Amino acid sequence: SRRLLEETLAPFRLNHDQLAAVQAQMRKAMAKGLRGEASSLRMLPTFVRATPDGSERGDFLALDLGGTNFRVLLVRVTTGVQITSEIYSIPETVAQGSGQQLFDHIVDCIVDFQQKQGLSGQSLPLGFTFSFPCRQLGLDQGILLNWTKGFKASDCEGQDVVSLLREAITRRQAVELNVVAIVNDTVGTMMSCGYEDPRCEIGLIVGTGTNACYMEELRNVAGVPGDSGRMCINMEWGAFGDDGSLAMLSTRFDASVDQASINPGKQRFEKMISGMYLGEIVRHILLHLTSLGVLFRGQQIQRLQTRDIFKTKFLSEIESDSLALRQVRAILEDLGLPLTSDDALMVLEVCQAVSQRAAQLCGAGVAAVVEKIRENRGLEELAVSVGVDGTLYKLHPRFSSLVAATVRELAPRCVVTFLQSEDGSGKGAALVTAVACRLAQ
Numbered sequence: 001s002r003r004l005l006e007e008t009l010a011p012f013r014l015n016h017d018q019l020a021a022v023q024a025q026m027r028k029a030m031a032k033g034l035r036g037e038a039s040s041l042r043m044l045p046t047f048v049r050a051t052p053d054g055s056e057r058g059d060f061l062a063l064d065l066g067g068t069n070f071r072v073l074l075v076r077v078t079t080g081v082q083i084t085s086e087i088y089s090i091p092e093t094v095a096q097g098s099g100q101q102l103f104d105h106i107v108d109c110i111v112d113f114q115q116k117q118g119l120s121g122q123s124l125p126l127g128f129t130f131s132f133p134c135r136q137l138g139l140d141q142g143i144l145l146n147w148t149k150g151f152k153a154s155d156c157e158g159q160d161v162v163s164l165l166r167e168a169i170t171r172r173q174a175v176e177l178n179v180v181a182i183v184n185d186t187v188g189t190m191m192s193c194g195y196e197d198p199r200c201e202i203g204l205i206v207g208t209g210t211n212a213c214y215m216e217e218l219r220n221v222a223g224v225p226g227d228s229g230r231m232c233i234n235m236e237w238g239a240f241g242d243d244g245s246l247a248m249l250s251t252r253f254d255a256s257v258d259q260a261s262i263n264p265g266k267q268r269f270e271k272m273i274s275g276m277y278l279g280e281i282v283r284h285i286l287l288h289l290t291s292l293g294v295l296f297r298g299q300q301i302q303r304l305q306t307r308d309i310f311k312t313k314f315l316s317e318i319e320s321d322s323l324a325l326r327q328v329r330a331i332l333e334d335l336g337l338p339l340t341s342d343d344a345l346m347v348l349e350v351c352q353a354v355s356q357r358a359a360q361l362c363g364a365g366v367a368a369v370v371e372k373i374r375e376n377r378g379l380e381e382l383a384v385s386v387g388v389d390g391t392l393y394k395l396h397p398r399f400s401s402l403v404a405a406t407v408r409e410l411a412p413r414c415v416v417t418f419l420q421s422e423d424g425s426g427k428g429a430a431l432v433t434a435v436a437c438r439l440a441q
């Protein structure tokens with residue numbers, strides 16, 4: 001009875017050696033990607049060559065697309081930083097619709113925002129936080145390689161997103177685009193937390209999707225020219241193991257989720273960690289358990305067939321230690337999954353199991369990065385801060401802690417501090433754009 005439950009959850013409980021191997025293999029994927037060999041990490045240059053270098057003034061507009069929230073932002077950088085913002089809705093219809101409609105909508109929001117802020121005629125430098133993989137050969141350009149997460153907008157892949165915006169601006173007849181800067185949310189976060197922490201050289205995202213960036217030494221980035229200095233690299237680690245190198249880890253439940261997704265075979269490592277997917281990993285487990293007769297006494301809970309019932313907000317609430325079992329059951333009776341205690345206990349165990357692996361994997365990841373940076377600089381010890389954002393990370397009872405613990409376990413010679421971004425990527429984006437303006441003048 002409970003024997004089957006543990007047998008089933010066994011693969012989600014990774015021992016030290018297993019986790020070390022994950023770190024080992026990411027470390028290898030990083031090496032290869034940078035030398036231009038075949039890696040599942042794209043290791044994309046971002047052309048951000050320094051964390052916030054002292055004073056960098058300017059008033060910037062800022063887009064933030066690809067997260068749970070799409071937001072337009074005004075960012076005023078002087079002695080201090082002042083941000084105004086407004087969220088707008090992007091339904092799956094628009095997100096997976098036509099590129100034309102997508103950016104038409106984006107522009108409409110900018111006009112709306114601008115009109116509400118009195119910006120109006122003034123065409124400001126835009127800091128575009130665009131949380132997807134781009135091939136950049138400069139701050140002011142970024143060719144979308146692939147959509148990820150919940151996006152599938154047509155006629156966009158292979159397009160420079162700065163162009164995609166121009167074409168929309170001209171169509172919606174908005175104010176002419178000025179200096180635009182493309183930044184990944186990881187890079188945006190890193191730079192935001194970097195504003196008031198010089199040792200911040202890594203951006204980590206664990207929300208809808210997961211990814212990381214970090215300051216690599218320029219000599220090691222074979223794709224780009226130059227030797228002196230360093231440059232931030234967007235690892236795009238969500239797609240880690242897309243080459244099938246993480247077959248060792250994939251459970252049957254991971255498989256079921258992947259095949260059932262918009263992008264089968266893609267972003268495999270992400271599908272074992274981030275908020276968009278964890279809830280589903282659980283659901284399949286529960287389905288398997290019910291069919292084994294363990295859960296629900298075999299009885300068919302059709303509601304369990306419904307996709308995306310276990311959301312981050314829920315996964316974070318279910319595991320709160322301040323909940324009594326009656327309250328856990330209440331929550332599930334409130335999602336249309338009434339449970340008996342025993343069932344409720346197994347469900348809660350399943351969540352812990354999944355979210356644990358999620359935190360641990362991410363930990364092994366951060367471990368590889370911090371080690372890479374340390375070894376890159378020939379150091380025996382490293383003090384480094386990680387600018388981190390994401391609702392899962394930010395809300396989940398144990399995730400952040402379990403990561404920090406894993407980073408100690410696996411990268412002891414490094415002293416890693418985690419900074420939670422209080423102001424989002426818009427702040428960092430603006431700082432990057434400041435350089436992009438200097439780079440034009």
Ligand SMILES: O=P(O)(O)OC[C@H]1O[C@@H](O)[C@H](O)[C@@H](O)[C@@H]1O
Pocket residue numbers: 064065066067068069129131185186188205206207208209275389390391392423424425426
């Ligand atoms: O998908 P989530 O939970 O909103 O987390 C990721 C996002 O978190 C936001 O706070 C950042 O400003 C975005 O740049 C980022 O993409």
Ligand SMILES: OC[C@H]1O[C@H](O)[C@H](O)[C@@H](O)[C@@H]1O
Pocket residue numbers: 066067130131132133148149184185186205207208209210211212236238239270
């Ligand atoms: O938003 C978090 C992450 O989502 C996906 O992994 C994207 O590929 C990546 O660009 C982004 O950083």
